[PDB]
Amino acid sequence: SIPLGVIHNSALQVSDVDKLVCRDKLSSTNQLRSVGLNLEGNGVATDVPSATKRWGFRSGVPPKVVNYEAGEWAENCYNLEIKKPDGSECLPAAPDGIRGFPRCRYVHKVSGTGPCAGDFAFHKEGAFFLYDRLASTVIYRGTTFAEGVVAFLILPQAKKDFFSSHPTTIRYQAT
């Protein structure tokens, strides 16, 4: 029951695949797109102290990953290298294929010795962590990520593609 959006004459409306009339014609498989939107645009605070308080550790839930094709510029992105007091690395190492968010104006790198208390780090408000083009539910060590959400669309058939219109870093401690 994943909602799917339909665009006609630059208006947006929700539609189950069953509700589609013949008017909202879907002719080719390249009309279907997935877009990942950073939630900085929804007014959230983006400083490191406020962002750290929205990530938490848990055990017993396996990670998951989903693909997204288009994205958005991020004004702030994060990079985490937290450690346990004994020197062990808390977060998992990045699996092959996950590189990092392609576009960030600023990248916050956080390193410290705050005690993690679980197997993985999740998002307490349900949002995803966005990498180059793979959205994940977990934080991976050393890889830049941007907080965001994913949406699915049926784009209009046109001679020009929908996605063709008008074509620093700081380090802080933690505990």
Binding site: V14, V66, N67, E69
Partner: protein, 95 residues
């Protein structure tokens, strides 16, 4: 239809995406000569069309609930087939 219920919604959208059909300029399609992983993107701006951008942001907020539960069920680590399934489910409903 969709109405935003979130503070300080951003009207603009500086997108980036990968062009599936490629540029194909001369020898640039050969990977030994092509651009690095950081250079395969194209980017633009959907200027001041807040009537559509504001809708997209709200749809993503609502789509998160359904997507998370779906990922909880599937046993595959990386999911790529959501759109293809919706293409099949569109055809199967038409007679």
């Amino acid at each position: 239809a969709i109405v935003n219920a979130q503070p300080k919604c951003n009207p603009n959208l500086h997108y980036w995406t990968t062009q599936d059909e490629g540029a194909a300029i001369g020898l640039a399609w050969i990977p030994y000569f092509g651009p690095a992983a950081e250079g395969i993107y194209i980017e633009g701006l959907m200027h001041n069309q807040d009537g559509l951008i504001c809708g997209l942001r709200q749809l993503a907020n609502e789509t998160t609930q359904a997507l998370q539960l779906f990922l909880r069920a599937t046993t595959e680590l990386r999911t790529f087939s959501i759109l293809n399934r919706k293409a099949i489910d569109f055809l199967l409903q038409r007679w």
